[PDB]
């Protein structure tokens with residue numbers, strides 16, 4: 001599961017959550033996203049391939065995933081309570097977490 | 107203040123953070139946005155003036171500001187720490203969040 005596969009998994013499950021019909025289906029997609037993010041966090045992006053692994057830039061990159069994961073966890077709390085709509089809206093605001101790391105690192 | 111003035115505070119102080127040279131300027135600008143975000147959170151926006159205060163439509167409106175304040179706080183830490191270029195880049199990233207709430211209720 002290389003980084004590009006993890007990104008597709010994130011991308012694919014956003015679509016799943018948008019057309020989901022109950023909070024349990026959003027929960028399932030959010031959990032798959034959450035593991036794809038933690039798996040993605042392990043990797044090194046191409047835009048930093050020759051920088052040092054312990055660099056400030058690799059830690060900034062790794063922290064972008066903690067910011068995304070914490071949004072996923074906030075959405076998971078709504079899904080687990082059955083608030084399908086509110087959790088669907090939550091998953092929509094993940095888009096900015098995707099973008100904030102994308103600018104400087106994609 | 108009313109919602110529009112708070113928004114003016116948010117919009118002008120973003121540009122100020124963009125043009126500031128030192129950390130005391132970013133911090134001062136970030137602090138005004140924080141109070142304006144928390145004050146705007148209490149308002150009802152026109153495009154929702156006929157719904158009811160505990161709808162998932164206006165749950166979403168208030169939660170947008172908790173998330174905005176959280177990122178202003180990330181930027182304030184960096185400023186307080188003296189990383190002007192990093193606080194300036196934290197603050198530029200708020201606009202994705204601005205535009206997301208805007209797409210819905212502006």
Ligand code: HEC
Pocket residue numbers: 003004007008010011014045046061062063064065068094095097098099101102105106
């Ligand atoms: C950093 C902390 C990131 C976060 C959060 C998200 N993404 Fe990402 N994404 C990132 C990088 C460095 C890259 C490039 C990797 C490469 O090998 O080029 C990507 C790429 C994508 C892609 C395209 C993948 C490809 O085929 O090259 C997609 C579709 C994508 N990212 C989607 C996506 C979504 C939906 C996110 C939030 C839910 C998201 N990413 C977060 C880095 C980071």
Ligand code: HEC
Pocket residue numbers: 109110113114116117120151152166167168169170171174200201203204205207208211212
């Ligand atoms: C919801 C959670 C919002 C967030 C986050 C931000 N804004 Fe906003 N904004 C919101 C509404 C409902 C409105 C319309 C209010 C109205 O009475 O029309 C706005 C409007 C603005 C405007 C226009 C102000 C005007 O001239 O009438 C500006 C310039 C603006 N907002 C800026 C702005 C910025 C820079 C933000 C984040 C950094 C931001 N807003 C966040 C709702 C929400």
Ligand SMILES: [Ca+2]
Pocket residue numbers: 046
């Ligand atoms: Ca690539």
Ligand SMILES: [Ca+2]
Pocket residue numbers: 019020021
């Ligand atoms: Ca459907």
Ligand SMILES: [Ca+2]
Pocket residue numbers: 110
């Ligand atoms: Ca106006």
Ligand SMILES: [Cu+2]
Pocket residue numbers: 067071097173177
């Ligand atoms: Cu965020």
